[PDB]
C-alpha cells in the first residue's frame, strides 16, 4: 500500500547485509554468501529500476570483498584446497558461473592456472616448436585413437597440445575451403556429382555439428545462446545442412547437361552455390575467436567487441532517416519508369538509370550513396521538367548532408566517450575471457580433433573450515582495523 | 643483350626492366629516410617522435583487418568463379578502362577488395552476361556488407583508439625528444668518420679521490634535503 | 615447490633493495647500482608477467632516484667530473 516506505525498507535491508563486517561475523561460508548476494542484487537492479545506481554499486562492493578475502593467502596448498572444494576446481567453475570477474583475474589464480596449463625461448624459441608440433598432428591423433596407451596418448592430454592440434585442424579446414574454388580441380553442367574435395570436407562439417549438438545438450538454448560467438556456429551449421540437402535434391531431378547461360533463377544448383559461399564467409570470420588467447591482440579484440552494442543504436536511428527520404523520392519520381530500349535497368549497369523508379531500387540507391558510388545524372527525366529535377536534386543533397556530416561525426564523437570507460577494465575482462577459454581444454570431454570423430566428503570440510577461520582472522585484522586509521580529519 | 630493338617489343622479366624497378623503389626509400633529421629541430622534433611511437598501436589493426579481407575474398571468389569470360576483351582485370572480371580469380579478388576502400571500384563489376538476378543480388550484398564493416566500423574504431593511445603520449614528449636529440648529437663528437660520403677513399689510481669526495657531498645534500625536509609536508590522519 | 611463497619472497627482496635510503647507506657507487637495478627489474618485468605492474613501477622509481641524485650539484666542475668518469 505504501510503496515508498516499503521500497526504502528493502533498500535498507540489502544495504545492510552487504557489509564485510557482518558477513565475517554471521556467515557459515563467506564466499557463497558473496556470490549469492551479488547475483540477487544484480537481478534486482533491473526490476527496481528507479533505484538503479545503488544496487549496481552494491554488486561491485560484494565482488570486491570476495576478491579481497581470497587475497590474504600465504601457501599454495591453502589456495589449492580453497579452489578444489564442493573433478577439480569446482569453486572456479562456480566463480565463472557467477561472473566474478575481479575474482578470477587475481594474480594468484592466474599463476596456478598457467602452471597447470603449460606443464612444459623469447620469440623463436617457441614459434618454431608450436608450428612443427602443429604439422604432424594426425599421427598423434591416430596413436591416441587406437592405442590410448602410455606411448604418446599421454602427450595429447597436456592441454597446450590439445589446443594446438585443434587449431591446426581448423587451419587445415580453412585451407581446403580456400582451394575449393581453384580452377585446377571443371566443366560446369547441371546437377553435378560431388567433386573430389566435397568428399574431403564432409568430415569437418559433420564433426563440427556433432560437437555443437553435444555441447548444446546442457544449455538447451537457454543460458546458452547469450554468447554471440555461438549463434554464428548455429547459423553456419544450418546453412551447411541446407547446402547438403539442396545438392542432393538437385542431383536427382535434373540429371543432364546444358550450357550454364541458358538456365533460370531459382535453379537448385545456383541456390546450392550461394549458401555455400555465405557459409565460407562465416567460417573465415569465426576464425577471429581465438585471438583472445594471445596477449597483444586479446585486450584489443575484447575492447572492440564490447563497443558494438553502442553502435546498433545508431544503425537503428539511421534506418528511420533512410526510410523517410526513400519515401519522399519514390513518391516524387515514380512517374517516369521508362525502361524502353534499355537492356539493363537499375543502378548497377554501366549507365545507371531508373534509380528512383520503384521503392526497392530507391533503398539501394540511397544506401550506395554513402560511399559515393552513385553518379549525379540519375536525377533526370527525358522531358525538361526543371522544377521537378531541381527538387529531386535538393532532396538528394539534403540526405547526403545529413548522413555523411551529421550522422557520421556524431558516431565518432560518441565512440570516443564510450571508449574512455572501457580501457579502465581491459586486463580484468581479457583475463576472464582467457580463463573461460582455458578451462574448456581441461576435462576429458572431446580430446579429439574434428575429422577423427567416428573420510573423503565428511572429513575434508575440517581443513577448509580451518582455512576459513585463518583467512577471516587475517582479513579482519589487516583490512578493517589498520585501514580505518588512514582516513583524514574533520571538525 | 648487347644490341638494340624497340622497347615495345620486349617481354617481362627482361633484365633492364627489373633494373629500373628496384632503382625506383630505392629512390622512394632514400627520400623517405630524409625525415630522420627532423629530430634536430624544435618545432617538428617532438611531433615527429610522438607520431613515431604511435605506430605500433596501428599494426594491430592492420592485422585484424587482414582477416576480414580474407574472409570476404574467400566468399566472393567462391561465388563468382564460374564466369571467367575473357572473350573479346583486350585487357582484363580491374585496371583497364572498362573494369571486368573483378572477382574471377583470387588475386584479382584481393585487389578488388583493397581498392574499394578509396571508392575506386565502380558498381557494375558485379554482373554477368546472363540475368541470374539472384546470384547478382547476393554478390552485391556481400560487397555492401564488406564496405559497411570496413569503412564504418574498422575506420572509426581506429580513430577512437588513436585518441586514447595519444593521451598518454603528450605527458612525456620533451623527455623523449631530448633523449633522441642527445643520441643524435653524441654521434658527431668522436673523430670517427669526419668526412662526407663522396670523399671516402696518478691518473686512473688517483682521480677516484675527487669523485669519491663529490659523491660524499652529493649524498649528504640529497639525504638532508630530500628525505628529511620532504618527510614533513605529508598530511594528518587519525 | 611452493611457487607462491617463493615468488612473493623475490618480490619483497627487490622491493627492498630499490629504496633510496638503503642505496645511500650501503653502496659503493650509487649511480651504477641504480642503473643495474633498473635494468634487472625491467628485464624481470617480462618473465614474471603475472606480477607485471610492480616491477614496471620499481623501474620508474629507480630512474627517478638516479635523476634526483645528480640534481643537487652546484658548480660546473663538479658536473664535469661526474660525467667524465670510467
Ligand atoms: O567454436 C568454434 C567454431 N567452429 C565451427 C563449428 N561448427 N561449424 C563451423 O563452421 C565452425 Cl567454423 C570451429 C572453431 N571453434 C572453436 C575453435 C576456435 C579457435 C581455435 C580452435 C577451435 C576448435 F578447435 F576448438 F574448433
Ligand atoms: C550550404 C549552402 C548550399 C548551397 C548549394 C545550393 O544552392 O544548391 C542547392 C543544394 C543542392 O544542390 P542542387 O540541388 O544540385 O542545386 O541544396 C542543399 O544541398 C541544401 C543543404 C541542406 C542543409 C540542411
Ligand atoms: C541499413 C539498411 C540498408 C538497406 C539497403 C538494401 O536493402 O540493400 C541491400 C544492401 C546492399 O545493397 P544491394 O546489394 O545493392 O541491394 O545490403 C546491405 O548493405 C546490408 C548492410 C549490412 C549491415 C551489417
Ligand atoms: Ca560453441
Numbering used by the authors:
A (entry chain B): 187 to 272, 284 to 317, 324 to 388, 391 to 659, 696 to 732
B (entry chain A): 459 to 659, 696 to 732
C (entry chain A): 187 to 272
From the paper:
In the GFB-8438-bound structure, we found an additional density compared to the apo structure inside a cavity formed by the VSL domain, TRP helix and re-entrant loop. The chemical structure of GFB-8438 consists of three six-membered rings: a pyridazinone ring and trifluoromethyl benzyl group at opposing ends are connected by a central 1,4-disubstituted piperazinone ring. Its binding to the protein is predominantly mediated by hydrophobic contacts. The nitrogen, the chlorine, and the oxo group of the pyridazinone ring form hydrogen bonds as well as halogen bonds with N442 of helix S3, Y373 of helix S1 and S488 of the S4 helix, respectively. The hydrophobic part of the pyridazinone ring is stabilized by a π-π stacking interaction with F413 of helix S2 on one side and M441 of helix S3 on the opposite side. The middle piperazinone ring forms a hydrophobic interaction with the Y373 while the oxo-group of the ring is engaged in a hydrogen bond with R491 of the S4 helix. The tri-fluoromethyl benzyl group engages in a hydrophobic interaction with L495 of helix S4, and the fluoride group is involved in a hydrogen bond with H369 of S1 and Y646 from the TRP helix. The residues interacting with the inhibitor are identical between TRPC4 and TRPC5 indicating a similar ligand binding mode in TRPC5, which is supported by their close IC50 values of 0.18 and 0.29 μM for human TRPC5 and human TRPC4, respectively. Interestingly, we have observed that the inhibitors GFB-8438 and GFB-8749, which have lower IC50 values than GFB-9289, interact with both the TRP helix and the VSL domain, whereas GFB-9289 exclusively interacts with the VSL domain. We hypothesize that the direct stabilizing interaction with the TRP helix constrains it and the adjacent S6 helix thereby arresting the channel in a closed state.
Here we report five cryo-EM structures of TRPC4 in its apo form and in complex with the inhibitors GFB-8438, GFB-9289, and GFB-8749, as well as CaM. Within the TRPC1/4/5 sub-group, TRPC4 and TRPC5 share the highest sequence identity of 70%. Both proteins can form homo-tetrameric channels that allow the passage of Ca2+, but also Na+ ions to a lesser extent. The architecture is typical for the canonical TRP channel family with a transmembrane region (TM domain) where the pore region of one protomer domain-swaps with the voltage-sensor-like (VSL) domain of another. The cytosolic domain harboring the ankyrin repeat (AR) embraces the coiled coil helix in the center and the N-terminal ankyrin domain is associated with the TM domain via a helical linker domain.
